[PDB]
Amino acid sequence: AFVVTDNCIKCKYTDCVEVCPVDCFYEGPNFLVIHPDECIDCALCEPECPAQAIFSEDEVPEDMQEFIQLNAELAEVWPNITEKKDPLPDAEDWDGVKGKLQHLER
């Protein structure tokens, strides 16, 4: 599985879904996650994310390890997203801001 980490939050560019061959992205109000059972680890989305939020599970930074389970959990309850949309309005402002997990919306 690949995993969406902190920097997506309040950015949510949704560039990543456009290259996903298996459509395993699931949508929250201000964040996307990858369904780990669905992901085929093609790695195609990693270079697509402007926020550079996506990692191979085995390359998730130690300080963002919580994101792994969080992706798996939210992927069970959020709706599939398979089409790019406008990035969130103040995305440029939040890109690069750390600890955005405190802003995650269910």
Q: Can you say which residues are annotated as belonging to the binding site for [3Fe-4S] cluster?
A: 8, 16, 49
2: phi then psi, degrees, rounded to nearest 5: -95, 165
Distances (CA, A) of 14 to 62, 77, 80, 95: 24, 18, 12, 14
Binds ligand F3S (CB under 6 A): choice among 1, 3, 32, 60: 32
Tell me the longest C-alpha to C-alpha distance in the chain. 33
Q: Does 49 bind ligand F3S (CB under 6 A)?
A: yes
CA angle 20, 21, 25 (to 5 degrees): 40
* Binding span for ligand SF4 by CB under 6 A among 42-50, 61-69, 72-80, 96-104: 42-50
Q: Nearest approach, Cβ of 90 to ligand SF4 (angstroms)?
A: 25
Q: Which residues bind ligand SF4 (CB under 6 A)?
A: 2, 19-20, 22, 24, 34, 39-45
